[model samples]
Target: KPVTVKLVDSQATMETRSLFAFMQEQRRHSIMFGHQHETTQGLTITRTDGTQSDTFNAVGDFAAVYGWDTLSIVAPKAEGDIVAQVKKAYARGGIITVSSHFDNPKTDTQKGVWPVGTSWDQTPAVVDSLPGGAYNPVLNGYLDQVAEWANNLKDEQGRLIPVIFRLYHANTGSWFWWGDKQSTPEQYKQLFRYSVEYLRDVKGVRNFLYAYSPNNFWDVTEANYLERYPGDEWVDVLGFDTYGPVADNADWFRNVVANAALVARMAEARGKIPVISEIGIRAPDIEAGLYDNQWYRKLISGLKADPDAREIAFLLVWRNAPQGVPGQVPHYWVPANRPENINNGTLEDFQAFYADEFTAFNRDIEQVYQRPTLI
Candidate 1:
């Protein structure tokens, strides 16, 4: 039994508290593996009548954590298919994490803005506009969609499904509109605080555990990481996203380990769960054959190089886009069990990674939503 970890949402559902406790307990020995859009798509597979996963194809098991995006949900579109897929993953005894890549509300075409529906629009003052600004209603509308989606997420037994909701992730970078370059720390904090208050207090959604993640900060110190953090009251998970080069790079590996160790220590002191919220080797690097066959093994071993870094709850890789799709590159993070991968040695290397006792896949965790007696 481990010490109970408090959640930011005081009224969090029993399932939510159970999830936090489970992850905290599991973090002591094994780091769970996750893949984005894992059930919906893969490099050579698509969600059909049966379950499909590149990780399953390679390692004979689904990832322990499943990553999904709220882009279409918040777009106010019909996302029943996504909802169905999320439930399927949850039913498989997997943890679900949702990240929002919200479109810039300021770039609405109805408002005379061009190039609508791009989160990369980088419209200035977007964060400031979220709280009592002209676009405040737009933000609320988006959050309303999120609240409805989250509130409706239930298991077959009618119990609410707990989800880790990661909002405004990678904010330290400028690619997204809410990046550091687009808003001040105060403005970002306001946007986060308002969003949480709206969902928890106003909308009464309680099955969510909020996660705050910044982009890769290789030289990240405690000061730099907390520069834009809202507060302990606003966050339950402390995480950061970092991607490695196409090929093995000593500097990248070293910094990743150091940063992960730093985050693990910070989370331990604050009673928050820590994670490698998102990580992967660049797609182009893999496409170009510059990928190291031993990348997966190196990543895990590198983290284990430091005792504290091994305490992270999970590490999630990016999505695997199916090939020949229009406007989509045939990129993959988890290697498929194909001839090319077999010939190139990636398949075997991934198998070795899966065999490591330090890595936990879906098959390794059971009854995760049930609260441990000792906690």
Candidate 2:
């Protein structure tokens, strides 16, 4: 059975981060970390003597600075060590947007590349962390841990909690022991139905809006988007992680918005959501970032027209500022501080610059809030 999300009067409280905030402010809702393919290892921020902090301090800053509803981190494979790190940060400030969840579990189901056999990549170093059974008890155990933490949390107002969680997001088609490639439409359906069933019935978990997001592969077509989508019933938000190929034309951003419009249209067809789960824009190849601001305007423009298209509730970028993929842009900008602010150039690239843009777009779409785009 599907869970009903009750409205608590108004939208949840939000935090805000700006470009100056990126440079001057402490790190908040978005932060960057490196990966050895499947698992993420934070870039060791070092001192002159190379003394480094292993914790993700930047992820902590993300929630502190940005009005982000939830800040998610890669669940540490090292277990207790990172748990202490996260607890320390949580104690310092409320920097949690959302807690970490698993992407794949090593289940004992498959023989050849199934359960405890498949590496996240084909790399040999990738061995199943769980050898005793097909499924990973350690990974499943952590989810429960998160549940306990949230259930017992407290703020100025009695007991506060964190409910939002993201898992297997864009990795939907990517295979794992507990699941396989979504080759057929039926395979996709079964996978989604099973997940919701277990969460609601067995785990006794509610107060969560499971986000189902696929990778940029879905950015190409509506079919690809639908390919990974479990169904409207199983999804709370339709989200994606989209980055573009290097050195495309000025229309690159426009193209992404075009792709999102299709998703927005499809979502409106059903009782669902449409959001840009994650985006990593880039600086111009060699010229640095001349085109970054232009790209943003064009991209937002394309998305603002269709009322159904402007239905994005929450949008996040890959990395804040420093941790971007070398020349990548975080779907936001930080202009030099100005009261009225203009998306003229450099300032157009920060988080706060989009405040007005989002406001205008939100108001533009209100005329058709509940109006259906589908025939």
Candidate 3:
């Protein structure tokens, strides 16, 4: 039985609509694996001249989903040519997901604990400053750049490429300016609605499927998860971002599975897609010996422990940075085929994870941007 997927945008591009349907159809049997900055950078490799993926070197296949950040677009950050990288991934039949880490509009210097001009700047009451506030033009200016970028994203055939625009992700956490602590529920909802309206109606950027992903909700009920939800009419994907336990804890995995099932039920009722939008072991945990090689296997097994948790479309891990990147620490989620990892059992367990029947990589998917006949 195939489930029909309805996009929030009635005037969405054909590719966008097909992508929504493909996610619904595929999540029935397998959950896709994703890595952030999979193509642009990696733990051992960093090359923007051509496409390179650490996942491919480890498992001989690229991730089915490619995660990217928009910090470079709306700010002075240098994260490589995101547009070019996205095009390359789309050409290889990979699903594209982009998260916006835009700068805080009300701040001009480093504020709070996070650096200024980045998404982590939590010093300002930002959401209220958008749309109807004093910083309305600032918001529009940011979106204007995003609109140009989205409008220019096209394949070789000149067809628009569909992207899952994950806006203000991990909002349940208080780290980002748009987090729950900084903005009221009504303000958050308005920001989401206004962004969609600005992009789709005002800017005419049609090749997008809006994803609403809050941070960890392990202790919250379905009602708690929907506390800051914009509306069903403004979102195409219902998902959440949760990281793994810093130490070897069984409760963390159980909570993840429980929340995943909760989200799946919500998606089922709403006729939308569910996803583990972003997930991975904490970098510090990996840096310490707190994580084991079997972490990936345990995660998949836990997700499969419940029927509803298996309904998630995909799960994405954070990026893999080299040993000494200027602003990043040496961190990687998907183990590579390096000697250090191979000596341990990390690489082996990841290979087993890739071989698992419950997971889908790039080679396992087909015609992802084409509408199914049965649909």
- Model 3, stretches more than 4 Å misplaced? 1-5, 108-114, 324-329, 372-375
Root-mean-square deviation of candidate 1:
2.4
Instruction: Please give the lDDT score at residue 242 for candidate 1.
Output: 86
Candidate 2, TM-score vs. the true structure? Answer: 0.55
Tens digits of lDDT, candidate 3, 236-273: 99999988765666788888888889889999899889
Model 2 lDDT on a 0 to 1 scale: 0.39
Q: Number of clashing pairs, model 2?
A: 25
For model 1, how does the per-residue alpha-carbon lDDT over 207-311 read when each residue is reduced to its tens digit? Answer: 999999998786769999999898999999999998778664778988888888888999999989999999887656665655688888888999876899999
Better of 2 and 3 by lDDT: 3
lDDT of each: 0.83, 0.39, 0.83
lDDT at residue 269 of model 3 (Cα atoms)? 92
- Report clash pairs, candidate 3: none
**TM-score for model 3?**
0.94
- Select the stronger candidate by lDDT from 1 and 2: 1
